[PDB]
Amino acid sequence: MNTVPFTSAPIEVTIGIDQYSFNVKENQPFHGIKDIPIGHVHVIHFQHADNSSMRYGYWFDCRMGNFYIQYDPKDGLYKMMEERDGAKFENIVHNFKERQMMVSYPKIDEDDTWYNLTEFVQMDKIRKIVRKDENQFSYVDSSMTTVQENELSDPAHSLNYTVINFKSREAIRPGHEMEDFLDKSYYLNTVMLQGIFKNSSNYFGELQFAFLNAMFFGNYGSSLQWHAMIELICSSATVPKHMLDKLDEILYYQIKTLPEQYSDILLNERVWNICLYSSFQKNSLHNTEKIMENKYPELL
Amino acid sequence: GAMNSSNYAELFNNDIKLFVDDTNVYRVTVHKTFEGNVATKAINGCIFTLNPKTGHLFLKIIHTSVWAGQKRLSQLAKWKTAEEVSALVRSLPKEEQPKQIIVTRKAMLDPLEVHMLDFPNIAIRPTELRLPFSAAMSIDKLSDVVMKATEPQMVLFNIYDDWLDRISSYTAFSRLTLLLRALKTNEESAKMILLSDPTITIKSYHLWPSFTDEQWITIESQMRDLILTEYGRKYNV
């Protein structure tokens, strides 16, 4: 069980840790978050009470270093940093634990939600999408655009998701124009899976990361990426059976976790109706279709 | 974006463009089978690709053999249209290639966009105009070449005959659309109007009769009257 201590909380903020969020008052005696499950990536995120503009946060894995949060009054945000002095860090955390100055990661023992949302997400792949190699953790915020959005502006602060574009030479083989546009199996299996991602786990990890950035930061280009990767699978007639079954589980937990009140901005009516009702895989996503129809029948 | 009333004169500027109409690519007769079911029999079709500035018509004849053994023919027909338009563009010298292609039906956009990915600078546009190019098979010489074809074939026409020697391409296109609209609304009457005077003949190298300027004004009036008439017969006005 790992810890992300805080130097303090000087400004009132809503703090998120994975799917959990709680309020910290201006100068509340607060030193951080303990009992964080080892073995998963995590995200600690922030929305200032005084300017809900810019949700922002950090993806991290506690196995990769000792990380802490410290407010920066010049840049005006809670920054993640790495403590390289491991003994200093243990000592600091112990004292925070002895004075009960840390909130506990509130995992229910029955609850596999976070694992099910991050099953294929790996810090090494996050750090290739979010390029800032001098840190072992990754900063994301509401406003960051994707490499594809910039094509259609600062490249250092972009989300380098894999570009998917159904009307592109990459997606369409010369002489199979109709075939490849109406049945995207070539683009999914040869171009994307064999060619770019190497395996379905890496594809699912990017899909899950894009969903999580859409949900926790309202990152619009992330939402576009999540829907494109769903649509590429549902619009392929030939998809391995294990990928379809795993996709159904992935999407089920994503729909289950989505705030009921955000479904209007995080869910693309066209993509979902197409995927569940018109696409090749319209009958292959039993769990997702059932939770969608019972929770968001308005979208459909 | 889309071509409409407000940017209509763009058709006659000096940027090469083509209209593509696919409404006569896939044509069928529907009939009863001996068992009393219904079946279709395909007949020859054509892609109607027109330069509205010059009158140059690229008539790609679609032979019924292209449908043999294929499924979902109405969807294939849009892709086959796009395949043939893309092949035409590639066959043209660079300086003859269009800078825009305007499709008359929005269902052609994605097929054509996909087939033209190699030509990212050629704009593929829809239009809000309801153009009557479906009536092109009411021009006898075009219908004749389509129905006689025994194989795929491209035939080149000037749909304006020699009109551009005397009138502008805006007026030539106005005349053509009026003629085609009339032929679409009442083919028999339209053709009766066009041919009632045997002293006015169609040159061997032309599609329409050799009317003087004065005779075209009269013809054009008769075509409007016909369209107005049919609108009245239709709606009881």
Ligand SMILES: CCOc1ccc(B(O)O)cc1
């Ligand atoms: C207002 C910030 O509050 C603090 C409370 C406790 C410590 B400490 O080391 O236990 C430090 C700061």
Ligand SMILES: CCOc1ccc(B(O)O)cc1
């Ligand atoms: C050190 C305890 O700090 C806390 C901060 C916030 C909450 B809460 O429920 O919003 C609880 C405790």
